[PDB]
């Protein structure tokens, strides 16, 4: 019938795309990075420990000034930290205690949070009245909020557990654009450095590259074997990395349009929950459910270091814009800043 | 003290005043007991939460606060979420207990409930959370087994080889067929409960009618036992 013919045509297109991708695989990344010096052993020591939250820390986001930070914990609280002095600048109670995401506006005036309430709440930090006040509530999604990322003071992209991303207009509170490609819960999204594209990984072992200005998927990358929990853009914006339930991270390229390197080991059998790149883009920081964090050489795929300082599963991981420190949160209600030693 | 400016000390004072309110919030956080309500379309959990919040005073999560013997329970019922529970059931990994409602009078969808219970029991993050198992619609089950063409043997073949134990202790006036069916259904869940428990994990199976008043007391007693075993575990007693 019609459905069978359409399915056969889809399989033919899959074969064509696979052959086109295979034709351009001149050599592997590991062969190209086979004479450079290994990174060594990245020994990172803890500098600050922040001990405010009472329950599982589910997300965090650094400030663009590289000094302030935000953190959400499922007791229903959102705390802004001064990392240098471990002071508490703001402590915001939330209407719903089931929060899965955080954001810090690049301007610094607003914060955002969402979760099992299917609503993204935007709070205005710099109020003439001396408070922190709920600026807006965006209530379009029909599933839990997994991630959110500011574009400017009036734009934000959200991903929900209903196979949908959305670009909003904060002033009007209405969805400007909707991205409806995934077939599983979208778990994360990372904005491009120029904020003209982004990527979304979902619970179907596929990542998709969306165009914010026109709202259509550009490319799809399917290399993983299980649900993807994390994603992050390469510093130059021409690649990204993904972590999934299988104990493998993967590096994908947007120009070659295929996977480049796999970061895995036999001893690791848990799932990755958070990935990030260093400022130069050579270290991949992956948080695991074995209470640890692994510093991989993004080239050569060698494992360079371990950040073992948490008593429970690591949920959120971020890197300072200066590239000076790494903030790791965990389910033991503690958040730790890590820095190198000369 | 020294090397701190005039504003750099007022910042510390504001941080300490924030910690004061955090310490006050910790107390009210510790006082209440958080429960997770779970069920299916035909469970009847809506009826029990309505009739239990009334007498014991498109959102993604519904909250119900009640109080028994001056202790506070906060129960969470999921709603307006989708059909895949892999990634939102990890939020409720530190709740006091999982209330699980099963429609007993539905033989067609009883293995579905059994598989749901198995997946909940064996989950890595819910591996240490006790379950209060309510088996609703005992009246409908009673009239279903008392006389009719429906038989439990067509779906569970081992019912015909099942006899109620010596220590049955049935409710007065119950037909032996009804009570045999009741303990067969309860054993179907207790088998899974005891197959992989290994401590820190206990199922509490109850038989609930449509409108039963003593449903808050059942949960109160079950939570008492749960917390008591936590205290015993922390002291290496049992």
């Amino acid at each position, epitope marked *: 019938s019609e459905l069978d013919q359409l399915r056969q045509e889809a399989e033919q297109l899959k074969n064509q795309i696979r052959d086109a991708r295979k034709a351009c695989a001149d050599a592997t990344l590991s062969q190209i990075t086979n004479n450079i010096d290994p990174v060594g052993r990245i020994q990172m020591r803890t500098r600050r420990t922040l001990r405010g939250h009472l329950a599982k820390i589910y997300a965090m986001h650094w400030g663009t000034d590289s000094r302030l930070l935000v953190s959400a914990s499922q007791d229903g609280k959102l705390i802004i930290w001064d990392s240098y002095t471990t002071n508490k600048v703001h402590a915001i109670p939330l209407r719903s205690s089931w929060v899965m995401t955080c954001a810090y506006a690049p301007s610094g005036n607003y914060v955002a949070c969402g979760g099992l309430d299917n609503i993204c709440s935007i709070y205005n930090l710099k109020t003439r009245e001396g408070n922190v006040r709920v600026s807006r509530e965006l209530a379009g999604h029909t599933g839990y909020l997994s991630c959110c990322r500011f574009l400017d003071d009036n734009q934000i992209v959200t991903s929900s557990g209903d196979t949908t991303c959305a670009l909003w207009d904060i002033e009007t509170g209405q969805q400007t654009t909707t991205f409806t490609g995934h077939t599983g819960d979208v778990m994360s999204l990372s904005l491009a450095p120029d904020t003209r594209l982004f990527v979304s990984g979902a619970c179907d072992a596929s990542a998709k590259l969306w165009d914010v200005r026109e709202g259509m998927c550009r490319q799809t990358f*399917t290399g993983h074997e299980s649900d993807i929990n994390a994603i992050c853009f390469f510093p130059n914006g021409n690649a990204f990395a993904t972590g999934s339930d299988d104990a493998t991270c993967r590096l994908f390229d947007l120009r070659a349009d295929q996977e480049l390197m796999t970061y895995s080991h036999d001893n690791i059998i848990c799932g990755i929950t958070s990935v990030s790149f260093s400022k130069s883009g050579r270290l991949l920081l992956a948080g695991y459910d074995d209470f640890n964090c692994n510093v991989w050489d993004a080239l050569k795929a060698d494992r360079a270091g371990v950040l073992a300082g948490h008593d429970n599963r690591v949920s959120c991981l971020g890197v300072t814009d200066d590239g000076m420190a790494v903030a790791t949160g965990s389910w033991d209600s503690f958040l730790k800043i890590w820095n190198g030693s000369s | 003290g020294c090397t701190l400016s005039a504003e750099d000390k007022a910042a510390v004072e504001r941080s300490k005043m924030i910690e004061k309110q955090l310490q006050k919030d910790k107390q009210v956080y510790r006082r209440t007991l958080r429960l997770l309500l779970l069920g299916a379309d035909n469970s009847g959990k809506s009826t029990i939460v309505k009739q239990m919040r009334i007498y014991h005073v498109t959102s993604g999560i519904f909250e119900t606060k009640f109080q028994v013997d001056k202790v506070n329970f906060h129960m969470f019922d999921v709603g307006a979420q989708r059909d*895949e529970r892999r990634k939102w059931i990890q939020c409720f990994n530190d709740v006091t207990a999982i209330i699980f409602v099963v429609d007993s009078s539905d033989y067609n969808r009883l293995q579905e409930a059994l598989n749901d219970f198995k997946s909940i029991w064996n989950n890595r993050w819910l591996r240490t959370i006790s379950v209060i198992l309510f088996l609703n619609k005992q009246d409908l089950l009673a009239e279903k087994v008392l006389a009719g063409k429906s038989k439990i043997e067509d779906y569970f*073949p081992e019912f015909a080889r099942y006899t109620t134990p010596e220590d049955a202790t049935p409710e007065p006036g119950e037909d032996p067929r009804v009570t045999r069916a009741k303990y067969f259904i309860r054993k179907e869940f207790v088998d899974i409960s005891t197959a992989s428990g290994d401590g820190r994990h206990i199922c509490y199976p109850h038989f609930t009618c449509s409108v039963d008043t003593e449903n808050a007391r059942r949960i109160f007693n079950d939570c008492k036992d749960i917390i008591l075993q936590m205290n015993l575990r922390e002291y290496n007693l049992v």
Partner: nanobody
Amino acid sequence: QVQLQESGGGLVQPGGSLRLSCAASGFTFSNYKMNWVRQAPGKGLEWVSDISQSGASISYTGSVKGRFTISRDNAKNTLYLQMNSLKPEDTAVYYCARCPAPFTRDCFDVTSTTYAYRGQGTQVTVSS
């Protein structure tokens, strides 16, 4: 990449026999517990059989216990279902499903609609 392609299954008389096969690709077959599920005509998805990674633990749905047998070939990457003594209520679309994560006992969302890791299904019609 992840693909579970089922084969076998067609018109058969009551009391007959059939062998459903499921070829798996795109993942490591030996690290996942695997299931056979079923959708009856005008009915919801129903879980039929289950087999662990090694195959030591094998489970059925009771209504078909004793007549169905689930098998696992980890070297050929295949999942088999032998159906014996079929009944007019055994006609349905059969799906070969994979649990979302490796090295786990629990298997969430296997019988859900629009589940990611599941085959397109084979139709079985037990009609005279």
